[PDB]
C-alpha cells in the first residue's frame, strides 16, 4: 500500500473540507492505531445543512507510519469511489493548520451483529395479525434485505478489484431506513462477553492453511456472515475449539448447522458459499441475482 499510494494524487477541490466547519464530539471507536470520532459538519454535501459524520483521525502519540497508513486509506477510499452499501468517503482535512482527518458516513445504529443480537425478542418471520402491532419488529424480509445489500456492496468492491479480508457482521454498519454498509484492544476491566470475536472463524480453508486472500475467500466469509444474520448475531461454531483439528475438519468438509432463524434456501446459500473449491463458490454478482430473487419471492 505504502510507496504506491504516495504516487496517487489528492484532488483538494473535490475532497478537501475546512476544519472550521467541523465540530468534534464523542468517540465512536478506539483502536491500537487510531480513532473514529462523531462530529457535526456544515455543508459537507453542498446544501446548507449541519450533518452528523464520522471522522477517522490519529491517536495522540501516533507515528509517521500511522500517518502514512491513514493517508493510504484516504487514497484507497478515493480510488474505490461511491456506493450505497459501503461506508463512503465524504471529505478530508489534509492541509497545514490542523490534524489529518478523513471524514466518512455516520451509521447511527452501529454494527449489524450487536444490533441483531439486541432484537431476538422483537422478531417474527412474517408480520401474522394486523401489521401495525408488529411495528419495529425484525422479520425475514429484513434479514434477507441486509443480506442482499451486503452482496451488492461486495459486488461493487470486487469490481474495483478490492478485497475485504475480514467480512463479518461486526464490520457491517446500519444507518437509517434499514440501509447497511460495509466498512473495514480495550482494557480488560471493562470487557464484557460479546465485545470481541475470533476472526479465524470467518476464514476460508485456503486462507487458514495457505494464507492467501482472494475475492472468493470473501465469498466464504460472506457465507459465515449469512449465518450471523440468520442466527441474529451469534458467534460462528458455538462452543467449538478453533485448533489444528478444526482447521483439518473444515478442509475435509465439516460445516456449521443451520441457525435458528434461517430459511432452507438461505442455508443452502451458506453451503454454496462454503464450497471447498474457491472457483465453485458463487461470485458476488451471482449472489446478488439470487438473493434479489429470494428477497422478491419473500414477497
Ligand atoms: C454506534 C456505535 C458505533 C458506531 C460506529 C459508527 N457509528 C456508530 C454508532 C460509525 N459510523 N460510521 C463509521 C463508524 C465507525 C465507528 C463505529
The DSSP secondary structure of 211-242, one letter per residue, reads: ----HHHHHHHHHHHHHHHHTTSPPSSTT---
Ligand 1 atom with the shortest distance to the CA of 107? 11
How many whole angstroms separate alpha carbon 161 and alpha carbon 223? 20
Would you call 255 helix, strand, or coil by DSSP? coil
With cell 466464504, the residue in question is 220
How many whole angstroms separate alpha carbon 299 and alpha carbon 292? 11
Domain boundaries defined on the chain? 1-106, 107-297
How many whole angstroms separate alpha carbon 72 and alpha carbon 269? 35
Q: Could you tell me the CA-to-CA distances from 74 to 34, 65, 90 in Å, in that order? A: 14, 14, 10
Q: What is the 45 CA–ligand 1 centroid distance (Å)? A: 19
Q: Angle at the Cα of 60 (from 58 to 64), degrees rounded to 5? A: 60
How many whole angstroms separate alpha carbon 5 and alpha carbon 73? 9
Candidates 262, 264, 284, 282; CA nearest to 273 is 282
Kindly report the backbone phi and psi dihedral angles of residue 41, in degrees, each rounded to the nearest multiple of 5, phi listed first.
-125, 130
110 is in an annotated binding site: no
How many whole angstroms separate alpha carbon 140 and alpha carbon 24? 38
Candidates 98, 53, 94; CA nearest to 73 is 94
Kindly report the backbone phi and psi dihedral angles of residue 193, in degrees, each rounded to the nearest multiple of 5, phi listed first.
-55, 145
Answer whether 110 contacts ligand 1 (Cβ < 6 A).
Answer: yes
Q: What is the 279 CA–ligand 1 centroid distance (Å)? A: 34
Q: State the number of CA atoms in the 13 A half-sphere of 152 facing the CB.
A: 16
Fold of 107-297: Transferase(Phosphotransferase); domain 1 (1.10.510)
Candidates 150, 183, 180; CA nearest to 292 is 150
Helix (H) or strand (E) holding 65: helix 64-80
As a residue count, the chain comes to 299
CB 136 within 8 A of CB 123: no
* Mutate-to-test residue for ligand 1 from 90, 105, 173, 184, highest number of ligand atoms within 8 A of CB: 173
Residues 6+ apart with CB under 8 A from 178: 142, 145, 146
Ligand 1 atom with the shortest distance to the CA of 181? 12
Using a 10 angstrom Cβ sphere, with 0-12 exposed, 13-18 middle and 19 or more buried, the burial of residue 41 is buried
Answer whether 87 contacts ligand 1 (Cβ < 6 A).
Answer: yes
Answer whether 36 contacts ligand 1 (Cβ < 6 A).
Answer: yes
Answer whether 156 contacts ligand 1 (Cβ < 6 A).
Answer: no
Using a 10 angstrom Cβ sphere, with 0-12 exposed, 13-18 middle and 19 or more buried, the burial of residue 76 is middle
Q: What is the 73 CA–ligand 1 centroid distance (Å)? A: 17
Q: What is the 104 CA–ligand 1 centroid distance (Å)? A: 10
With cell 490542523, the residue in question is 98
CA dihedral sign of residues 167, 79, 77, 177: negative
Relative to beta strand 22-29, strand 35-42 is: antiparallel
Q: Which cell is 184 given?
A: 473495514
107-297 shares the fold of 1-106: no
Candidates 47, 34, 111; CA nearest to 73 is 34
Would you call 292 helix, strand, or coil by DSSP? helix
CATH homologous superfamily for 1-106?
Phosphorylase Kinase; domain 1 (3.30.200.20)
Q: Which cell is 290 given?
A: 439470487
Q: Which cell is 186 given?
A: 480495550
Relative to beta strand 101-105, strand 110-111 is: unpaired
Residues 6+ apart with CB under 8 A from 3: none
Answer whether 295 contacts ligand 1 (Cβ < 6 A).
Answer: no
Q: Which cell is 153 given?
A: 456492496
**Catalytic site includes residue 166:** yes
Q: What is the 297 CA–ligand 1 centroid distance (Å)? A: 32
Technique of determination: X-ray
How many whole angstroms separate alpha carbon 217 and alpha carbon 254? 17
161 is in an annotated binding site: no
Cα 178 to chain centroid distance, Å, stands at 14
Kindly report the backbone phi and psi dihedral angles of residue 55, in degrees, each rounded to the nearest multiple of 5, phi listed first.
-120, 115
Give the number of other CB atoms < 10 A from CB of residue 43: 13
Q: Which of 40, 166, 184, 272 is catalytic?
A: 166
Candidates 211, 199, 219; CA nearest to 277 is 219
Answer whether 54 contacts ligand 1 (Cβ < 6 A).
Answer: yes
Answer whether 25 contacts ligand 1 (Cβ < 6 A).
Answer: no
28 is in an annotated binding site: yes
Q: Angle at the Cα of 38 (from 32 to 44), degrees rounded to 5? A: 120
Amino acid at each position: 500500500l505504502d510507496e504506491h499510494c504516495e504516487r496517487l494524487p489528492y484532488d483538494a477541490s473535490k475532497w478537501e473540507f475546512p476544519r472550521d466547519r467541523l465540530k468534534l464530539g464523542k468517540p465512536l471507536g478506539r483502536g491500537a492505531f487510531g480513532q473514529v470520532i462523531e462530529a457535526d459538519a456544515f455543508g459537507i454535501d453542498k446544501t446548507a445543512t449541519c450533518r452528523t459524520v464520522a471522522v477517522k483521525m490519529l491517536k495522540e502519540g501516533a507515528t509517521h507510519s500511522e500517518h502514512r497508513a491513514l493517508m493510504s486509506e484516504l487514497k484507497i477510499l478515493i480510488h474505490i469511489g461511491h456506493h450505497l452499501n459501503v461506508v463512503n468517503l465524504l471529505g478530508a482535512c489534509t492541509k497545514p493548520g490542523g490534524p489529518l482527518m478523513v471524514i466518512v458516513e455516520f451509521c447511527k445504529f452501529g454494527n449489524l451483529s450487536t444490533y441483531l443480537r439486541s432484537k431476538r425478542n422483537e422478531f417474527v418471520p412474517y408480520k401474522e395479525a394486523p401489521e401495525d402491532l408488529y411495528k419495529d419488529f425484525l422479520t425475514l424480509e429484513h434479514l434477507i434485505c441486509y443480506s442482499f445489500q451486503v452482496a451488492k456492496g461486495m459486488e461493487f468492491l470486487a469490481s474495483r478489484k478490492c478485497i475485504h479480508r475480514d467480512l463479518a457482521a461486526r464490520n457491517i454498519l446500519l444507518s437509517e431506513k434499514n440501509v447497511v454498509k460495509i466498512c473495514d484492544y480495550k482494557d480488560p476491566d471493562y470487557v464484557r462477553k460479546g465485545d470481541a470475536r475470533l476472526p479465524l472463524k470467518w476464514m476460508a480453508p485456503e486462507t487458514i492453511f495457505d494464507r492467501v486472500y482472494t475475492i472468493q475467500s470473501d465469498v466464504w466469509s460472506f457465507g459465515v456472515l449469512l449465518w450471523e444474520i440468520f442466527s441474529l448475531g451469534a458467534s460462528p461454531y458455538p462452543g467449538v475449539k478453533i485448533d489444528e483439528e478444526f482447521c483439518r475438519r473444515l478442509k475435509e468438509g465439516t460445516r456449521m448447522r443451520a441457525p435458528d432463524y434461517t430459511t432452507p434456501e438461505m442455508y443452502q446459500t451458506m453451503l454454496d458459499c462454503w464450497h471447498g473449491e474457491p472457483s465453485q463458490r458463487p461470485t458476488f454478482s451471482e449472489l446478488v441475482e439470487h438473493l434479489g430473487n429470494l428477497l422478491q419471492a419473500n414477497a
